[PDB]
Design a protein around this nucleic acid. Structure first.
Lengths: 169, 139, 145, 294, 159
RNA sequence: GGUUGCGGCCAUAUCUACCAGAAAGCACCGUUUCCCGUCCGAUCAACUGUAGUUAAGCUGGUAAGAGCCUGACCGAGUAGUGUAGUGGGUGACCAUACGCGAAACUCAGGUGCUGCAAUCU
RNA sequence: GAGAACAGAAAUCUCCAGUAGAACAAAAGGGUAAAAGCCCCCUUGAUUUUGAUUUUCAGUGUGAAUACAAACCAUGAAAGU
RNA sequence: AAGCUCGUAUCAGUUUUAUGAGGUAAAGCGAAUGAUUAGAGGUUCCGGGGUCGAAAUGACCUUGACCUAUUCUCAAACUUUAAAUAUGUAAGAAGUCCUUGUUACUUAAUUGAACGUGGACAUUUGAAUGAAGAGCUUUUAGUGGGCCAUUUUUGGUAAGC
């Protein structure tokens, strides 16, 4: 029925798709460091694309992954910025959901003009207890059909705490 | 076919496709039989004994007109081709008695020009949705 | 060609006895276009052995003209008369190998009265000579003997 | 999920071996532990299988046969109450004890137990059990870690240490025992001994005791109940070795009910399936149900 | 020009069996081989070392050597009008005990035994195989099996 | 009979969906002093067996279920083929004689078996 | 496939399905899924001696290759390689 | 050509029995790859052109693309299946069984591995058929343009090519 299997954040992934290498990317990364309190990880370009100005294996973007109580606090901050309203897109078929903010100063965070202003993606993935089953080395398995996150279930979860609005369809 | 019985009184099917490529060597002094492998010249269908070339479906009314299409048609092909009329309902299969027993039973669903046959094999659920007529009170 | 030789048939109209089993039956199959064969009667065997029985004795081919000759080579297996020989042939039986081998290949003439068909090299079933003509081998061999 | 598998996909699909499907056996490793030199004929390669469940430590000396693997002897941390240990039954110290037990146990049954003492001393210094002269070579065994990660300080090499100190020849190296310094490229045997007798659990017990009566009380509910004070962990383990060396022989559980009695209940909670006829009836029924459009 | 590399012509020969690609099961590594054993060679193209050249695919020889990872095999190969003796170093993945030497040894035992019970009864034996024999007379009955008579059938088109 | 560890063969064992599971086991599951590894104790390491749960895993059942397996005078003695003729036929090609013999098709049945060691109302 | 500010067909971030439909310098074929592919850690077995063996064959040479013996090393907890 | 060593033997352009290997013929294509005719249904909530309020970030369109279940037809360099003919090995005295000797190899181990002593078992001693004797050595001639027929088969319109 419902005892164990509650439903929760697996992780929060803050992503700043910077777009270039050098000072600006090192500057953005500092935003994620000074926010996640972790040290962030940098992504390289999969391939060259002239009209975006990036070369393959050039570091274009930074992200950082957060878990447990701290990720839940940063999530809240974001929601605040969008005045507790997301859209019925936003939520994946497989139970996760996300949103983005422009200017990160909109959630705590002073200004330090040597840092500047960055917008950012927010992706939060939902699971239940027992995900370990699909993540562990020995006897890796798949989570049962009942169990396992869905757009319906997690939209309703999210409305129900957060006291929030989904929107549109 | 069309002028005697109408743009519409039959369905003619060319049952043979010209997949085999013919070559010409092709001589333009002259080179010789040196390196004589040909270039592609044309296509052909490799046809067998008793292998069907054309098929036509019409209404029983049109038998004679139909045969004359296929009789007029022979004069365009090398070899000996016979015109056989078949026990078999149209292009399906099943001799008309066995096709009929079926259609008067609900086992046959019209698809795109051809047709779909009720099986006793898949899921009970969706064979019932596929062939409602087959299991229904009905008359 | 090999089979013909292993069966001691290396000359036209020469003939021998074969014990039928699977290991020999597949030999007769391989050879069928080149031979005529069948089921010999006592009569036929009696007369083949009386008229044209010769034995093998230090290679040499020796006419069986006294029972002493048979006993001297086949005595060791029972078989001390020409009729002892015929019996080990017709009943097959335990020394058939050795008895039969002692008998040289029979040298028949062409059939007196003919082959009875316009063409020998088709099967007996197809109008004649070659293959197993069964009982009808006696009539053919009798005219060849 | 509309990610449906075409009947063609399934039809050409080649399944992994069963134990591969079920995530238990690494076959690349198995080929290399098991396969014997061809000119040593039927000389068994013997593995020291060590596994951990969430509550038990399994220790097995196993060898191979086309018709299946064959165990020479086995020992389980669950046995350890017999010899004085009643808690931390999957901790490093138990891994060590279990490796000791299996060692003394098999080479008891091998005759080899008196010749090849082991260490007896124990300061956890790096040493293999080396062969007597003019006598039997020691019984040799190769660690099978299964799917466990080779981390420097892993429980699994605790079982290796107990079993090596037990007198088995189990080839190995220091660099995964706790106490190996990657900068130093040395092994501080002080640290390793500490683990053998549970030092890391013991020090924690004290720190927690002094800094959190409450959390100390849950994590060590047991020790509290048994009046086991912390700085007597070493005795427990030290005395446990004594016991184990004193008497490695296997005594099997005392066993209420017989294999038969077990059978007649123990999965006559087993669903029994239908005969091709009952199935038909179900078929014919389901239609009569389903027939008639909607 | 022409091309005759070492693995020339081997596309279907060294291929793995349908739905049988991948790891080779351990049985293969657990067979024991002795000098004088009779093995059949058959390449496993997933193991490129210790591999028989393709002439030896499908051929059976005798083990003449045993090594860490391979057996040496003696094959008699015909070159010209004469067999030459060839020795091969095949890894074990490519070799398999000849199953007919097994029936044979089994029968040799069976034979020794048949001989034993025969002597310890003091009777004749008969130990060699006879081929399939002609077939003895029978009487077939007609009780429930009155012969059904058949005739040839008229031509007919089914198209 | 269940369950676990190590297996043999490697779908009758896989796939999809829905049920059900006593006891023990197994599991999920609590913790972060310690050895150890992470962007992240999620995985990996360690610690308790203590606070909890059969939800999942896992085991078994259901299904005119997809697949896989097996059988059959199901198709078919068909297709193809070794051998024979101064056989037919302008030829394409075909028939007969002595033999060997498929695949698809159809229908029926089936859906892991098992070795070692341990443990269990 | 379903999801996430600027973000677009195409940038980065989750999750699901996924028998190989990818990758493995190169032609093609074979082979491979806790790998033979991808990321990382340590390395010089691409070394030393001299025989046997497989292909091509005359059972000469050459190229290539296989399994041992005797050294000295690499790696790994180890079996091993 | 010269012989030599022996003498029923192990032989063999053959069968049988047993046990292997093979991917051609055929077959297949609502099975993988590749090709190919036709509709049918459903998708696009993420390619597009309209008409409906220019309206459209909204409907019903026809048109692609794609998906599902069907449908007609194919492969020397495609295939799950898979022949016939050809093809490897075996059918014992150099064998079998019992006892227990040697070693520096090998094993936890007189444990294995090899090779042996001593003891036992010869009527069919281990299928068939044949054997015109089997085995072996040296030396040397000519030849090193080939062509034809059935069947398989490649190039070519074909050819007494």
């Amino acid at each position: 029925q419902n005892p164990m299997r509650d439903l929760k954040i697996e992780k929060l992934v803050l992503n700043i798709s910077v777009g270039e290498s050098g000072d600006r990317l090192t500057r953005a990364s500092k935003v994620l460091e000074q926010l996640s309190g972790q040290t962030p990880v940098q992504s390289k370009a999969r391939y060259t694309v002239r009209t975006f100005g990036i070369r393959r294996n050039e570091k274009i973007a930074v992200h950082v992954t957060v878990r447990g109580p701290k990720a839940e606090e940063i999530l809240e901050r974001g929601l605040k910025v969008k005045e507790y309203q997301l859209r019925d897109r936003n939520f994946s078929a497989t139970g996760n959901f996300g949103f983005g903010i422009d200017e990160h100063i909109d959630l705590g965070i002073k200004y330090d003009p040597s840092i500047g202003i960055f917008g950012m993606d927010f992706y939060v993935v939902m699971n239940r207890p027992g995900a370990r089953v699909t993540r562990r080395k020995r006897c890796k398995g798949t989570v049962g059909n009942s169990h396992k996150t869905t757009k319906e279930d997690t939209v309703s979860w999210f409305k129900q705490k957060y006291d929030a609005d989904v929107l549109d369809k | 076919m069309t002028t005697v019985s109408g743009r519409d009184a039959f369905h003619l099917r060319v049952r043979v496709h010209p997949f085999h490529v013919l070559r010409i060597n092709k001589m333009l002094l002259q080179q010789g039989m040196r390196g004589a492998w040909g270039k592609p010249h044309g296509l052909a269908a490799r046809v067998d004994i008793g292998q069907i070339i054309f098929s036509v479906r019409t209404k029983d009314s049109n038998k004679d007109v139909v045969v004359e299409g296929l009789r007029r048609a022979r004069y365009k092909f090398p070899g000996q081709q016979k015109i056989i009329l078949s026990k078999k309902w149209g292009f399906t299969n099943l001799d008309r008695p066995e096709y009929l027993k079926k259609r008067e039973a609900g086992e046959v669903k019209d698809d795109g020009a051809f047709v779909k046959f009720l099986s006793k094999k898949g899921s009970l659920e969706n064979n019932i949705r596929e062939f409602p007529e087959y299991f229904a009170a009905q008359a | 060609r090999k089979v013909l030789q292993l069966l001691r048939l290396t000359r036209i109209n020469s003939g021998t006895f074969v014990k039928v089993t699977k290991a020999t039956l597949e030999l007769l199959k391989l050879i069928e276009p080149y031979v005529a064969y069948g089921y010999p009667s006592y009569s036929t065997i009696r007369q083949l052995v009386y008229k044209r029985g010769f034995g093998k004795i230090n290679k040499q081919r020796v006419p069986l003209s006294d029972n002493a000759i048979i006993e001297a080579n086949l005595g060791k297996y029972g078989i001390l008369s020409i009729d002892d020989l015929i019996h080990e042939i017709i009943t097959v039986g335990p020394h058939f190998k050795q008895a039969n081998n002692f008998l040289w290949p029979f040298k028949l003439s062409n059939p007196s009265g003919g082959w009875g068909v316009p063409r020998k090299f088709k099967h007996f079933i197809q109008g004649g000579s070659f293959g197993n003509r069964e009982e009808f081998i006696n009539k053919l061999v009798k005219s060849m003997n | 999920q509309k990610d449906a598998k075409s009947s063609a996909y399934s039809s050409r699909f080649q399944t992994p071996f069963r134990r591969r499907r079920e995530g238990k056996t690494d076959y690349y490793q198995r080929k290399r532990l098991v396969t014997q030199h061809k000119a040593k004929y039927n000389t068994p390669k013997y593995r020291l299988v060590v596994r951990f469940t969430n509550k038990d430590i399994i220790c097995q000396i196993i060898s191979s046969t086309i018709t299946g693997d064959v165990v020479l002897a086995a020992a389980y941390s669950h046995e350890l109450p017999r010899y004085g240990i009643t808690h931390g039954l999957t901790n490093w110290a138990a891994a060590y004890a279990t490796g000791l037990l299996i060692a003394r146990r098999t080479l008891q049954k091998l005759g080899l137990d008196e010749t090849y003492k082991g260490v007896e001393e124990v300061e956890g210094e790096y040493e293999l059990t080396e062969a007597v002269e003019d006598g039997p070579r020691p019984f040799k065994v190769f660690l099978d870690i299964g799917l466990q990660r080779t981390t420097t300080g892993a429980r699994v090499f605790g079982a290796l240490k107990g079993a090596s100190d037990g007198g088995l020849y189990v080839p190995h190296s220091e660099n995964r025992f706790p106490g190996w310094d990657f900068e130093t490229e040395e092994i501080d045997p002080e640290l390793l001994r500490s683990y053998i007798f549970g030092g890391h659990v013991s020090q924690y017990m004290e720190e927690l005791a002094d800094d959190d009566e409450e959390r100390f009380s849950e994590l060590f509910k047991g020790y509290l109940a048994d009046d086991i004070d912390a700085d007597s962990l070493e005795d427990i383990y030290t005395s446990a070795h004594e016991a184990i060396r004193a008497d490695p022989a296997f005594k099997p559980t005392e066993k209420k009910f017989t294999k038969e009695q077990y059978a007649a209940e123990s999965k006559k909670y087993r669903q029994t399936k239908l005969s091709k006829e009952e199935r038909a009836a179900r078929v014919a029924a389901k239609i009569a149900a389903l027939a008639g459009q909607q | 020009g022409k091309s005759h590399g070492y693995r020339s012509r081997t596309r279907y020969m060294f291929q793995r069996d349908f739905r049988k690609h991948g790891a080779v099961h351990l049985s293969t590594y657990l067979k024991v081989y002795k000098v004088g054993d009779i093995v059949d060679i058959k390449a496993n193209g997933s193991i490129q070392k210790g591999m028989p050249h393709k002439f030896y695919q499908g051929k059976t020889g005798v083990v003449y050597n045993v090594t860490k990872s391979s057996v040496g095999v003696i094959i008699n190969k015909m070159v010209g009008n004469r067999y030459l003796e060839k020795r091969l170093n095949l890894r074990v993945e490519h070799i398999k005990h000849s199953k007919c030497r097994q029936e044979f040894l089994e029968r040799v035992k069976a034979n020794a035994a048949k001989r034993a019970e025969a002597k310890a009864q003091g009777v004749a034996v008969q130990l060699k195989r006879q081929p399939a024999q002609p077939r003895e007379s029978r009487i077939v009955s007609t009780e429930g099996n009155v012969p059904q008579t058949l005739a040839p059938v008229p031509y007919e088109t089914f198209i």
